[PDB]
Design a protein around this nucleic acid. Sequence first.
DNA 1: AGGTAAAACGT
DNA 2: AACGGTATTACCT
Length: 202
Amino acid sequence: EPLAAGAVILRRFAFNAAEQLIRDINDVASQSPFRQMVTPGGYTMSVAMTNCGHLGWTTHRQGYLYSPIDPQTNKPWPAMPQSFHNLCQRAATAAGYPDFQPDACLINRYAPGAKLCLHQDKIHPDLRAPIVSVSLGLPAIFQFGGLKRNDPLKRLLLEHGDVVVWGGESRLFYHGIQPLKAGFHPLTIDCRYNLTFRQAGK
DNA sequence: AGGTAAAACGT
DNA sequence: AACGGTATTACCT
Ligand SMILES: O=C(O)CCC(=O)C(=O)O
Ligand SMILES: [Mn+2]
């Protein structure tokens, strides 16, 4: 059974690419470090984040923003690694979105206990562009709901190499990650990473 | 008028 | 511990 209208899970899709993806996460973060962002209301998120590409997701006192500049370094986010871009395009194509041109990649790092509460990915300049979401490392339980917060959730374990793609009818669906269990993975040791690809600009 | 914060405590 | 309240408003443009 597929995930939803316009949505699919490509299990272990990124497994072969994962070692290089992780090397390139480390390179990105060497330039724009992982940081735990603070919400407009003043709470520090448990997931640590950075970005690459032309636009990075950030919080600010005034809201959420896709920005061309990393507010911590005052420099552009690092260029999107070719490994990231190539994996993203292969996964998008396999999922039925062959024309996707991301300009933004949000890199999440989950330590044990870290979560991401149910939310919608908002800001869609192209209603035909999906979200491509790549899991690395330790396993996590992903929630995928509907257009309204109380719509029933599907709960899916996401393991190393899994890729989730949503878009079209499901582009604005609520989703999140449950608190990460401690464990070991040979390539990330003690964390999970996620890559979220978007077209956030015109 | 219409979008966005809550991507964040009690039962 | 899964579910849902809260934004049932206060601000911006
Ligand atoms: O880590 C995940 O699988 C989900 C990440 C996410 O929803 C986000 O960064 O917007
Ligand atoms: Mn998201």
